[PDB]
Amino acid sequence: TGNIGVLVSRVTNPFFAGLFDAIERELHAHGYQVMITQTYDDPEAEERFLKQLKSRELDGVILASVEAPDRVMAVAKAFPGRVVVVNADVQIPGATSLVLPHYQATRDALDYLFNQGHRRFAYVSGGTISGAHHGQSRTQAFLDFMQAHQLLVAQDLLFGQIHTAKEGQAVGKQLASLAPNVRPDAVFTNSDEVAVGVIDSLLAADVKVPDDIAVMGYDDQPFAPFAKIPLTTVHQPVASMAAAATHELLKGLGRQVAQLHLSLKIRQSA
Amino acid sequence: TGNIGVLVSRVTNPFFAGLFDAIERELHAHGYQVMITQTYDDPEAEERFLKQLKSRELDGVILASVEAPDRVMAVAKAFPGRVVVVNADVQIPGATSLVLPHYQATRDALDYLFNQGHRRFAYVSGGTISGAHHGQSRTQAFLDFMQAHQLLVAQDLLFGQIHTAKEGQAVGKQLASLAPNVRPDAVFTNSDEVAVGVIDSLLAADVKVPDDIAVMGYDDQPFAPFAKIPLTTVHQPVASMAAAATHELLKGLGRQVAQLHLSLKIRQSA
Numbered sequence: 001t002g003n004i005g006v007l008v009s010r011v012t013n014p015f016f017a018g019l020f021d022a023i024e025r026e027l028h029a030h031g032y033q034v035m036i037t038q039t040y041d042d043p044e045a046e047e048r049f050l051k052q053l054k055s056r057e058l059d060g061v062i063l064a065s066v067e068a069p070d071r072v073m074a075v076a077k078a079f080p081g082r083v084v085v086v087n088a089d090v091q092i093p094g095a096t097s098l099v100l101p102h103y104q105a106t107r108d109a110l111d112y113l114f115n116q117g118h119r120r121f122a123y124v125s126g127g128t129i130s131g132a133h134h135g136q137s138r139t140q141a142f143l144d145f146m147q148a149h150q151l152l153v154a155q156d157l158l159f160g161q162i163h164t165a166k167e168g169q170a171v172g173k174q175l176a177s178l179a180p181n182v183r184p185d186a187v188f189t190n191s192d193e194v195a196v197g198v199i200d201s202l203l204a205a206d207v208k209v210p211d212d213i214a215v216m217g218y219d220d221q222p223f224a225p226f227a228k229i230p231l232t233t234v235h236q237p238v239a240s241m242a243a244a245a246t247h248e249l250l251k252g253l254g255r256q257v258a259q260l261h262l263s264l265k266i267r268q269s270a
Numbered sequence: 271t272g273n274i275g276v277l278v279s280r281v282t283n284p285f286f287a288g289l290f291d292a293i294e295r296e297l298h299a300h301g302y303q304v305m306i307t308q309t310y311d312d313p314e315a316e317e318r319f320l321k322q323l324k325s326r327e328l329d330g331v332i333l334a335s336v337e338a339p340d341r342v343m344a345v346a347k348a349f350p351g352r353v354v355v356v357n358a359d360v361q362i363p364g365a366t367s368l369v370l371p372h373y374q375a376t377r378d379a380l381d382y383l384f385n386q387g388h389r390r391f392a393y394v395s396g397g398t399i400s401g402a403h404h405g406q407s408r409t410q411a412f413l414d415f416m417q418a419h420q421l422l423v424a425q426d427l428l429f430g431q432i433h434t435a436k437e438g439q440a441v442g443k444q445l446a447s448l449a450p451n452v453r454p455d456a457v458f459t460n461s462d463e464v465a466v467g468v469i470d471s472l473l474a475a476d477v478k479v480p481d482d483i484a485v486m487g488y489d490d491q492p493f494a495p496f497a498k499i500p501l502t503t504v505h506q507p508v509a510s511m512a513a514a515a516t517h518e519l520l521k522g523l524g525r526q527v528a529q530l531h532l533s534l535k536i537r538q539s540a
């Protein structure tokens with residue numbers, strides 16, 4: 001039982017830190033040493049990481065972020081059993097791949113919001129909304145939801161490449177600046193980090209959350225229940241997906257014998 | 271420019287995630303691939319990590335946590351220039367070692383608290399307070415502070431091996447249960463994660479923060495300003511220490527030519 005690598009976009013995303021920790025504690029119990037690398041969505045960083053498996057510095061890898069599916073596929077095909085993909089919204093031929101139903105969860109969270117009476121929506125993504133991006137199952141869910149309710153998408157309430165709390169503060173400060181009649185009723189943040197920042201800037205401006213603007217998180221990160229306005233959010237089953245990924249890897253490695261729900265978490269912010 | 275390892279106790283500690291990120295972005299700019307491993311304070315995990323340098327799978331290492339100084343020293347002496355230690359409250363012969371003045375910062379934060387009128391103190395540590403532990407410069411500062419003001423240490427208000435928000439919730443629930451006359455006036459948490467959990471349980475019990483119990487954080491983690499009661503805390507200079515550590519490593523590697531304050535951050539919780 002040797003070295004395993006985990007690949008994520010950003011370790012300071014508490015979702016990824018928590019996924020890594022759950023994977024690492026189980027793999028460690030099985031005798032492996034686990035290391036994490038972050039890409040910041042750079043395909044070159046993904047390539048470089050995969051060279052560690054190609055050169056057999058690692059026995060196996062778990063990818064929780066994917067930039068170049070075709071590159072990952074070629075590695076997986078060359079290293080059968082040694083590449084596992086988890087929660088990257090992609091199935092990679094040659095790699096056991098776990099996909100969670102983010103389109104469904106996003107539609108369900110948006111329906112929740114519509115059912116509370118919200119009609120003017122702001123939508124935030126970590127990707128560039130106009131092109132292919134991380135989180136596009138969610139962007140499609142958003143567009144399908146708006147179409148299903150014949151709601152006009154306001155382009156001025158779409159925010160792309162927003163990842164951190166500090167970026168969310170800037171979004172929230174802009175939304176708080178808006179006249180009541182053009183301000184959104186609700187913000188779909190795609191991230192609890194972003195949500196905390198959005199909410200902080202709204203409250204700084206005496207904008208009421210949720211009464212003036214409801215804020216929907218994503219992930220149910222550790223701080224979510226502890227936030228100033230405890231976050232309503234989409235809960236990802238971090239421990240369960242970690243256990244699943246870990247088992248798939250250990251099975252592929254020949255270590256283990258053969259033998260995941262998103263949920264809406266309602267608190268105060270929406 | 272090759273592979274660098276970073277060693278920390280726990281990646282889900284936002285202090286460590288943030289330190290890693292700052293190191294990694296600078297090293298990445300210099301052409302290195304950086305990986306992080308966590309120990310959960312297990313000396314065997316530290317040993318295993320150091321084998322990666324001994325076997326030259328890594329070019330260099332940065333340790334932000336140390337379990338067995340003498341073991342780290344032997345490696346550093348065998349691999350001159352390749353082992354850097356940062357913020358581990360230890361100087362390791364053979365490794366450039368950066369120490370921050372946590373005893374001073376702790377005395378200063380406690381003096382702050384005494385000056386606000388607090389007299390009955392609870393003290394929380396991530397270590398086992400009775401023996402040698404991570405954070406003992408801080409424990410000594412606490413005991414010296416109490417002695418300097420002739421304050422009796424209440425053993426029942428000392429909490430060891432407390433690391434996470436969930437553990438802090440349990441501490442806070444116990445403190446909130448206390449009759450006003452035996453309840454502390456102030457809690458020194460040693461961690462912003464712990465502080466958020468303590469405060470949440472106090473507020474759940476209608477204990478006022480800071481009026482009934484003041485809560486002092488440690489680190490100034492990303493969520494600190496965003497907490498329900500924004501944290502008064504000891505700010506660690508994450509970006510500066512990362513840059514320093516990175517430079518010391520790159521100098522030792524022959525890549526770079528030759529060429530840190532803690533501060534009290536006052537917000538609302540104390």
Ligand SMILES: OC[C@H]1O[C@H](O)[C@H](O)[C@@H](O)[C@@H]1O
Pocket residue numbers: 013015064065087088126134135190191192218219
């Ligand atoms: O934390 C926000 C998001 O970050 C990453 O994109 C993860 O892959 C996604 O699952 C998570 O929702």
Ligand SMILES: OC[C@H]1O[C@H](O)[C@H](O)[C@@H](O)[C@@H]1O
Pocket residue numbers: 283285334335357358396404405460461462488489
């Ligand atoms: O996050 C709480 C503490 O965790 C670790 O012990 C770090 O070494 C220390 O610097 C930090 O204050």
Ligand code: NA
Pocket residue numbers: 185210211212213
């Ligand atoms: Na409203």
Ligand code: NA
Pocket residue numbers: 455480481482483
């Ligand atoms: Na008081």
